[model samples]
Target: RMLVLVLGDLHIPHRCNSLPAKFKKLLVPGKIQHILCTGNLCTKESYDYLKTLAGDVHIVRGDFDENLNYPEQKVVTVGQFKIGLIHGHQVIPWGDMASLALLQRQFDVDILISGHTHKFEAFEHENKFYINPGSATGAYNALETNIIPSFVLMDIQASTVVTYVYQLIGDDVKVERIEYKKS
Candidate 1:
């Protein structure tokens, strides 16, 4: 089984305590096979932290990543799944499922992970699983309180992907389990 940890939208410059300490505690190196970061980290320090978690790090430069080394989109294979990753800032009017679906088709991936809306969403539609880990560090947005910082852990094996979600709410972290299967 291969496990990839997904986090994004740290927006570090705005808030020093954006990422909860508990989330940082679980992010020890060696436990993760890959780190899929959807950018908006806001500083090199956040990138450095991700480097500590996994060697295989896939990052798409968000509107604020600053570092040009990261691409706008990245593709990686985990077990039997071809995964497409990106920070959706380039897509106009973020949170449009149709646009994200097209991106999945363009990459020919079974799973697509993205962030930018700062809202957690996961669902399977038209044979592909889409995920937005949300702002792993709560940052301000247009709607609702950008409160709970969250992240996702995915276990990929053969054609199955099992996802575990973690969200920090007022110093308490909660977990949810969900699964996706591909034909």
Candidate 2:
């Protein structure tokens, strides 16, 4: 099985100082195999923090990213899955299903990982999986007064994946599990 860490919209040193202490405690290195980040990591220090967690780090550019090296989108292969990574801000309506559907088709990926809404979401579009890992740092959004810190973990075994959602709520951690199998 392959374990993938999916997260993004971490506006460090700007919107927030760092990831929640509870999240940092749970996301220790070595256990995770790959990291798919949907950018918005505004500083090099934030990027450096990801490097310390996993060897394979894939990132796509976000609206607020300072580093120009990050691409607009990225495709990553882990086990039997081809995962597409993108920051939703690039999508015309910023997370609209129709807009994202076009990008999903372009990538032709088994799973699409994205962020920028600072909210967690997962769905199946035409049998392909789409996930938004939310803001690991719980960075503020335009109007949302309260945003929970969150991230996603995918445990892939061949054609099936067990996805875990990690959220920091009111001084405690909550975990939810979801399963998806390729048909």
Candidate 3:
């Protein structure tokens, strides 16, 4: 199985100092085989930190990211799935499922990952999987003053994937799992 770490919206020094202490403890190098970042990392320091976790790192541009070289959208194939990544800010009325669905169709991807909402969400729409990993730094959000720090990990095989969602609340870290299989 391929272990992929999905994360984004780490506003970093602009909004928060760093990843939560508990989160740092869980995200050591070597555990993850690849990293998919939805952008808003804000600084090269944060990007370098993700590189330490995996050699194959994919990132898209967020509104706040200073790195202009990163593309606005990216599609990567892992195992049997085509995964698309975007920062989600360009979508009008941000975080709307319909807009995300449209993008999903446009990309023709099996899974679409996005951030910028600073809230964790995962659901299936029109047989396509969508995920928003929230803010990894627990930074102040555009829609809400308070934000929860979270990320996702996917264990992907040829025909199936098990997604593990991790969220930090009040010094406690919570984990939940969801499974999806190709039709």
Candidate 4:
């Protein structure tokens, strides 16, 4: 089984956080198969931190990313899944599910990962998994006033996907089991 962690919208520069001390402690090298960041990392320092956790890190340019070299979108291959990665800002009004579905079809991908709405969601549509890991640092969101500050850990085994959700409340992080399945 491959345990790939997906998170984004760290917006590290504006927050009084360094990837949640608890999360930092668990981010050991080689243990994580891949780190999928939907962007808004805000600085190269955050990107470097992700590099330390896994050899492969896929990032899409966000509204605040300092790296202009990063494209606005990306596609990653994990095991047999073709994953489409985006920041969700380019989709117009933000977190537009219909637009995201179009992107999934355009990319011909089985899994779609995006962040920007700062909301954690995981569900399957048209037999494809769409994941928005929300703001790991609980930066800010337009639609929802609550910062929440959440992220996700995904376990992929052959054709199965097991997702775990983590949300920060005050100083402690509350963990919960979310949706899971396979194509």
After aligning candidate 2 to the native by TM-score, how far in Å is the CA of 72 from where it should be? 0.6
Q: Candidate 4 lDDT, tens digit per residue, 60-167? A: 898877788887887887776777888988755447888777665535877888888998888887778888999988877656566887888887877777778888
Q: List the residue pairs that clash in candidate 3.
A: none
Clashing pairs in 2: none
lDDT of 2 by residue, 6-49 (tens): 99888888889998889999988898888899898888887788
| Model 4 C-alpha RMSD to native | 3.7
The TM-scores, one per candidate, come to 0.88, 0.90, 0.90, 0.84
lDDT per residue (tens digit) for residues 36-113 in model 3: 999999999999999999999999999968888999898899998999998988856646878767665546999999
Per-model CA lDDT versus the true structure: 0.84, 0.86, 0.88, 0.81
lDDT tens readout by residue for model 1, 66-180: 8998888878888888888889877555488887776655458888888988898988887789999998887766676755789999988888889999998886889999899
Off by over 4 Å in 1: 92-107
Query: Model 3: number of clashes?
Result: 0
TM-score of model 4 vs. true structure: 0.84
